[PDB]
Subunit: 495 residues, 2 copies
């Protein structure tokens, strides 16, 4: 189906902004603003070399700059829906239906849009594409319930189709070259992520779908060869946007928060994730303009053709570890999946198993204090004292802290997901910002269950062209307060 | 002989509108308005792809559009009586009579006109032919009593004639190529249908003629090869009107009501009646204009030369089942005929007996709930929970429900008969309309014994040229109220 060759790659490139060589740097800018200066900053992975953007008032110090919010909404909504609608029209609304192609597009749409609703809360969803320019907003709750149901339906369609053929649009699928089995595994894995996410809002919904995902006969992403990633596929070569931000823009450095954990635990992944050289030097997030102060500080270790991962195998293990802790039927104890998650992450990073075993038995090392050699006034104490080695007799919160802190280290550099899990659980504990220049009521907080960016505010463009519908969503679902301090539906632990 | 070649085929083509390739699309339009958008809709077999007809105010949402009623009355009355009167004039009212030809013409006339009176109630009948277009109406009761007596006399005439010759106008009869024996079987089978129809209005009349039909030595339609159909005959090839409505007009889709039963029962006839693809997607009747929403939804599975059936063999089994349930001497139990009807329908649809046996022994499957994936507001619960397998200890209503629901699936796509039987018994229980734009006091009702279209109102043409006679019929037989909420004589159970 050559007709789908234009839309499918574009839809996949919209999940996490990325493109080919001819297409690059433009989407790199979307990645820089929507991920590198957003979730990466707020989750403590990375900090700008120099906080100079917009007169030093930007996402990194909690100033929700209007131009950036308009931009992010645009590429997280319009760029996802446009190619999806065209695939839906051709595969479902013209001639003979092609359900397998629609099931594929649905899986990719949810891979993109779960990040969008996690970012903003309520979003246009069920009413999109029904002939109206002004579109009504769905509650985040209904969107998540729909995601879970759509993924299950998508997997069933592909499972029925697997009897007929093992491939769907192979010449145009960058992720798995059309492999139907790998798509079912990703869809099941994504369902598990989204089920765990809703635990605190609705434990019953979480149990239902977490158990469906782990019990489905098609399986889950359980090896690095099955990971959902954008690198080489369909004859194309994606270009890592973080490499461009690092080398060409010289705009990013190692974050103080992730340093505390990596350095404290003497973590062998530190040298894989960042260029160690003589030693690590990290930058604290939410600080004043510093000129050339952090030029010699640690940069991420990333190359031009390094794949960008929607989901790694190690993440599935930590999701099952938490599902086990939650009382769901995951087919194992929380401790066993936790240890397996650590082993998988080391394997994923090219580290040997002996190193992994020694690491997961470590019960003495704790997160390190942060020292800023350029500015001692920015030095901070370790945000946590949690150790690595699993303890069966630990409190439920301590068990959760370990699982999420280790998942956090495994899923690096996916700052969007790291930020979401920090919002949902409070982990890993962050080193709070040094300065707050917010225009959206954001609190410095305690780096755990209070404060930080809880969501992006809605874009001005929605106030200008869809104001009635936006007002209804804000009133119904955000308690009348459209700012970054307001919590989304699944965020039910924080204060 | 040649004299009858002009009138007999025209009379047979007027029973249910259909014609050869040269005279098609005009009769397709009669079939579309008189069956596809009337009985098929109200019985739940099919719904329009897009409800756009007459600014979305038409039969499907209970608006009895004047132009359509005039049209329907014209082809259900004038088109039947014209060729019949000429056959009568030549075969009875001129010198040497020909009783066998008139007998054949009578059977075909009743095949047509029982649908007309079921549609309108009282109609011109006994006073037709003598004086003008100003003809007095007969009560439906008198018309039915006459039908039953006329069929018996017709069969008696053909029986006497069978001793002299086995054929009548073989070169011009499209249905049975002049086979006198096959015509006698159809006459007896039609008598049975009309006998059971009058059960609730007059149980004595029903018993008399139901027993006459099943005891007559000529027999009934007891095999697929004896079915009364319009396809290949007398050297002509009829063209299925549903195929044209489906492919050329793109105007019809699977109904939500029939979906519930076919999908819920995992019915192997579903893929024979409709084009399955990945699965089924049905459309609810009585809804707003939807543009391209249902373009990809399920279409009927039908080809250019597929026969159109006046009566299938399996229906005879379901009529006997009910007759036995009513206490008549049918020569078997209700359960035995019920099961035979299911096996017969499976054979009629080219399915093996192993499928049929597993199906009729199914005591757990229930009709499915209806989900509209394009518009969640149109989703509905299953209208019934009746299961397939016969139960001797069930209530009399449950036994009737089973018989009628299975007859309904067996006689697809005969919407006229399906609608007539729903009005008479309330079965199968329907998914009610979503919107009611009625101009004729029709109630949404409960999909069972309350509401729905109870008849077509009389046409304006009759108010304009036969007003005095029409008024008398309305006053005497319809309680002074000519609308679609008023009931016809045989409709005695409903409220």
């Amino acid at each position: 189906g050559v007709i789908y060759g234009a839309y499918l790659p574009n839809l996949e490139k919209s999940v996490i902004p990325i493109g080919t060589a001819s297409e690059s740097t433009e989407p790199v800018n979307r990645y820089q603003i929507g991920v590198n200066l957003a979730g990466d900053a707020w989750a403590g992975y990375m900090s700008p070399r120099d906080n100079k953007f917009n007169g030093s008032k930007n996402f990194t110090n909690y100033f929700m700059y209007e131009n950036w919010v308009n931009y992010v909404y645009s590429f997280m909504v319009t760029d996802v829906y446009s190619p999806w609608m065209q695939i839906k029209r051709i595969s479902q609304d013209e001639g003979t239906r092609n359900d397998e192609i629609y099931a594929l597009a649905q899986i990719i749409k949810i891979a993109a849009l779960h990040r969008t609703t996690d970012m903003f809360g309520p979003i246009p969803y069920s009413q999109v594409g029904k002939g109206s320019f002004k579109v009504a907003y769905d509650s985040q709750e209904s969107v998540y319930r729909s995601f879970l149901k759509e993924l299950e339906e998508a997997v069933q369609t592909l499972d029925d189709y697997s009897n007929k053929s093992k491939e769907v649009l192979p010449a145009f699928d960058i992720v798995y070259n059309g492999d139907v089995n790998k798509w079912m595994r990703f869809a099941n894995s994504l369902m598990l992520r989204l089920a765990i996410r809703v635990r605190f809002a609705d434990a019953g919904l979480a149990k239902e779908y977490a158990e469906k995902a782990v019990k489905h006969p098609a399986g889950l992403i359980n090896s690095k060869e099955l990971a959902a990633q954008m690198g080489k596929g369909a004859g194309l070569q994606m270009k890592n946007p973080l490499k461009v931000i690092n080398e060409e823009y010289n705009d990013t450095r190692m974050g103080a928060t992730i340093y505390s954990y990596l350095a404290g635990y003497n973590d062998a992944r530190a040298a894989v994730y960042f260029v160690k050289n003589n030693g690590f030097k990290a930058v604290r997030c939410g600080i004043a303009k510093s000129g050339d102060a952090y030029n010699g500080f640690t940069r991420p270790n990333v190359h031009e053709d390094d794949p960008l991962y929607w989901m790694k195998a190690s993440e599935v293990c930590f999701l099952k570890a938490e599902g086990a802790l939650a009382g769901f039927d995951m087919g194992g104890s929380a401790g066993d999946f936790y240890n397996a998650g650590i082993r998988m992450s080391f394997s994923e990073n090219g580290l040997d198993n002996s190193s992994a075993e020694t690491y997961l038995k470590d019960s003495t090392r704790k997160p390190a204090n942060y020292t800023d050699t350029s500015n001692g006034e920015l030095s901070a104490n370790a945000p946590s004292s949690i150790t690595i080695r699993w303890e069966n007799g630990a409190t439920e919160e301590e068990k959760l802290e370990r699982i999420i802190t280790q998942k956090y280290l495994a899923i690096f550099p996916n700052g969007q997901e790291a930020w979401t899990e920090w919002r949902r659980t409070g982990y890993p504990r962050q080193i709070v910002v040094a300065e707050n220049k917010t225009n959206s009521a954001v609190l410095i907080g305690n780096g755990y269950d209070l404060g930080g960016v809880r969501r992006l505010p809605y874009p001005r463009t929605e106030y200008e062209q869809n104001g009635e519908n936006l007002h209804n969503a804000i009133s119904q679902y955000l308690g009348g307060v459209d700012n970054a301090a307001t919590k989304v539906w699944w965020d039910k632990k924080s204060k």
